[PDB]
Each structure stands twice: as C-alpha cells, then as structure tokens.
C-alpha cells in the first residue's frame, strides 16, 4: 500500500527521524520525533489492512455475481445440451443395431411403433424411396435393427395393397411411394 498520502507522510517522518538518530543527538529531539512519527505510523497501518479487506471483499462479490449469471445461463439451454450429450454418448457406445437404426432414420426409414423383442408381434416402418427398399428388402425377408423379419403386407399412401412382385426398378415410379411394411420377427 504505497499509493496513499498517509504512506508519504509516514515515509518522510521515518526518513527524517532515521537521519537525525544516525547523526546522533539528545533525548528531547528523539522524543519529539517519535511523538510526531507514531501518529503517522498508525495512520498508515490502519489503511494498510482496510484496503486489503476491501479488495478481497470486492473480489468475492464479483465471484458470486459471475456464479449466479453462469447458473442462470446454464439452466436455459438444457434441451439442446441434453440432445447433444445423448448423441455423443450414442456415438461412443458403438453398437451395430443402434448404428443401423440411426442411419436408417437419418436416411428416412423410421419405425411407427415400439420395436418388439418377442418372436412375434408386428413392426411397421416407412420406406420413402426405391433405394432404401433395394438395400433392406430383398426377396421376402426384411433386415432391420440387426435382425431378420418376414414381409406380409405392403400399403401405399392411397392405402391400396401392393404385391411384392410389382416393385421393380422401372415398374415402381408410378406409385405412391411412402410404403408401409408390416413384418414379424423371424426366429
């Protein structure tokens, strides 16, 4: 704390008294010098701690306000944060069935109900283009979620039944394409 007038006064008094004492002198001069020195020393010493307490208190207050602002900010982005985190962990898991269904949904082939686990029960998906049908459906079997399923019904956007033999490269582009395959889980 060397930026206060009290420090300047105390330093000048210290220098004057020290020089006078080192020069050598009587008792009355020493007494007068110390009576004029100690008041300035106390004046300096009070502020020397008051300033420190003020500075640390200000630092703590700024810390607390930063923490409050950050918490208020954080509690307002939870949906996006959670979605990003979930997909990061889904990457890190690295499973074949999960990767299969995520890529299928990313290209457009999403399911319509909860995927069953038993050797029975119906599953319905939507196939929006011929390329997805070429990749997944070949023959009369269906490969989805790293499993095997058996096609039993095909329905178009007009809800008319389409037989499996109908679908072909050039024979397809005269149809309502968002097909709906309903299959059951092969053993």
């Amino acid at each position: 704390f060397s930026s206060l007038p009290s420090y300047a006064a105390f330093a000048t008094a210290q220098e004057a008294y020290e020089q006078a004492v080192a020069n050598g002198d009587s008792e009355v001069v020493l007494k007068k010098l110390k009576k004029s020195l100690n008041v300035a020393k106390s004046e300096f010493d009070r502020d020397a701690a008051m300033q420190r307490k003020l500075e640390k208190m200000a630092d703590q207050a700024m810390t607390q306000m930063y923490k409050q602002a950050r918490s208020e900010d954080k509690r307002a982005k939870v949906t996006s944060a959670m979605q990003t985190m979930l997909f990061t962990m889904l990457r890190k898991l690295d499973n074949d069935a999960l990767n299969n269904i995520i890529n299928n949904a990313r290209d457009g082939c999403v399911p319509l109900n909860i995927i069953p686990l038993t050797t029975a029960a119906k599953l319905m998906v939507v196939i929006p283009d011929y390329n997805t049908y070429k990749n997944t459906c070949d023959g009369t079997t269906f490969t989805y979620a790293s499993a095997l399923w058996e096609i039993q019904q095909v329905v178009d956007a007009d809800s008319k039944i389409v037989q499996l033999s109908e679908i072909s490269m050039d024979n397809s582009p005269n149809l309502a394409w968002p097909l709906i395959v309903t299959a059951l889980r092969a053993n």
Binding site: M57, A58, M62, M65, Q68
Partner: protein, 293 residues
C-alpha cells in the same frame, strides 16, 4: 443477462434503468450515459437498491456494496466502497472496457421522444449495428406511442355495416382509415373470446367487413401489440462481386418476350445484391418470372 455493448466493444451485464429498450451500457459507457443526461438508475443481474426492509433509494451514485448486498445513503451502514466511483460503475467486465468517443449518441437520439427528423438523420449517420439499434428503437417507439389511444367497442349492436360505437375514457383517437386494424377480443366474464378482425372508418357507425360477423354485447376492438425482439443478423450484406458464374445451373434458351432481360441475367450471374428505383412496370411484373425460368 450477459449481452453486448458494441460501440465500446464491451460485453456487459448492466443496463439503464429508465430508458427505451433497457439498453446495454458498459461501466464507463453507463457512466457517461448517466452523467451526460439524467438516468440515475441501473439494472444488473440483480437490481441495485438498499436491501434493508422498508428502505427506499432509487439512486445508484450513493449506494454501497456491503455484505454480499447493497446499502445506501440515508440509511447508511457504510462499511464498504461506493458503487459509482473512479470513472466507472461496478460490475463484471470492469477491466475489459474501452469507452466511447462520441459521448452523445444515446444522449442525443435516445433522449428525445423519438419523433423528430434528427433521429433518422443520426440513424443514417451511423454504423450497421448502431442503425440496427436505431431501427429497433423506432419500432419500439411506434408501438409505445400506439399503446396510448383508445379501444373501440360495440355494446348494443345494429345492422351490419351500420352500427353504434362508444370508445374509451379520456384518451384521443388515432387516424381514421384502415391503417389501424381494430382486432381486439371479447370478454364473457374473465377470459378472452373469439372476436375477429374489424376496421372503423365511417361513423350510426359504418364498418368494412374483413369477415362477416355476428356482433354481441360489449365486443371490444383494438390492436394489442407485443414488442419486436432483438435481431441477430445484419440487414444489408457487404458488396462483394463474384469471381465467376461458378456454382450456377445455366440454361440454354434465352428470354425473348422481355427485351431487357439478358444483360441483367448476366448481372445476376455476377451481382450479389440488386436494388432499383421504379414505379409499377419496372420488371416487378415479369423480370422475377424471367429469372425463375
């Protein structure tokens, strides 16, 4: 909370307590906002006011930062340092601040009633973001001085397109044409009820029907307005002409019925923004289709 004061290029958490849009001003920037004019009240993450029960101090120039709180002048526990001191106001970003050379931007145009031509004059003598602040404040003043007039209502109904109309308590009436759509709401006992869109010009009160209506008792018509949110993208894009016609899907045929289209087609080929000054019949009828084809 944490926004942006940009003239001083300073992230801020402060804002002027009594102003147009709760504008964001940094420490020194809030300071010369509160000494060049009279705005002796600010808002931070928390508002600055003495926290003892029953105390009341609007001013900030004499508050102190006490024990994780704020205290004041008339009711003074002064074991603290003053909030407003040393050319700055206490807050975050108290060190990473620049200041403003043009001291009186807000002090000039945010201090008048937002109706003189000087507002628009300075708005055109601004930067892109400063003029964005200007435009948003013009929308704000439009709405805030539109919400100072009456609400029309039909209490006993007559034949459609010729009704009776009483208005409000003491307020004046705005201009008369269909500029202000009288689309209010109806109240059954506490709630708001389907009303429709109306407009009052002729008054015996003749109405124009944006829809066909069966008006009931008390039906109130007035424009109830929200406030336009701040925008995050610039208005105009800087002028940069293209290197080539790279990235275009060219065609083979050339428009013939339009006799001033081919050179302008090439212009769109290497022009980034395009404005012209024309009455009806300036390509607005056919040139858009010309580009479309």
């Amino acid at each position: 909370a944490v926004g942006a004061c940009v003239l001083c290029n300073s992230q801020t958490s402060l804002r002027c307590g009594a102003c147009i849009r709760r504008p964001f001003l940094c420490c020194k920037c809030c300071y010369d906002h509160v000494i060049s004019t009279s705005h002796k009240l600010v808002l931070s993450v928390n508002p600055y006011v003495c926290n003892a029960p029953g105390c009341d101090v609007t001013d900030v120039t004499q508050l102190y930062l006490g024990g994780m709180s704020y205290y004041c002048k008339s009711h003074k526990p002064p074991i603290s340092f003053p909030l407003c001191a040393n050319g700055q106001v206490f807050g975050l970003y108290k060190n990473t601040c620049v200041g403003s050379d043009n001291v009186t931007d807000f002090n000039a145009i945010a201090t008048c009633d937002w109706t003189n031509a000087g507002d628009y004059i300075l708005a055109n003598t601004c930067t892109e973001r400063l003029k964005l602040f200007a435009a948003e404040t013009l929308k704000a003043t439009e709405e805030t001085f539109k919400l100072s007039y009456g609400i029309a209502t039909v209490r006993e109904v007559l034949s459609d397109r010729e009704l009776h109309l009483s208005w409000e308590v003491g307020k004046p009436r705005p201009p008369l044409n269909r500029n202000y759509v009288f689309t209010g709401y109806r109240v059954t006992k506490n709630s708001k009820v389907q009303i429709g869109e109306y407009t009052f010009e002729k008054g015996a009160v003749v109405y124009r029907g944006t829809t066909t209506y069966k008006l009931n008792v008390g039906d109130y018509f007035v424009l109830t307005s929200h406030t336009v949110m701040p925008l995050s993208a610039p208005t105009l894009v800087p002028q940069e002409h293209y290197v080539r016609i790279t990235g275009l899907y060219p065609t083979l045929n050339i428009s013939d019925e339009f006799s001033s289209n081919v050179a302008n087609y090439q212009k769109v080929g290497m022009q980034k923004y395009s404005t012209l000054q024309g009455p009806p019949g300036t390509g607005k009828s056919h040139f858009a289709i010309g580009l479309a084809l």
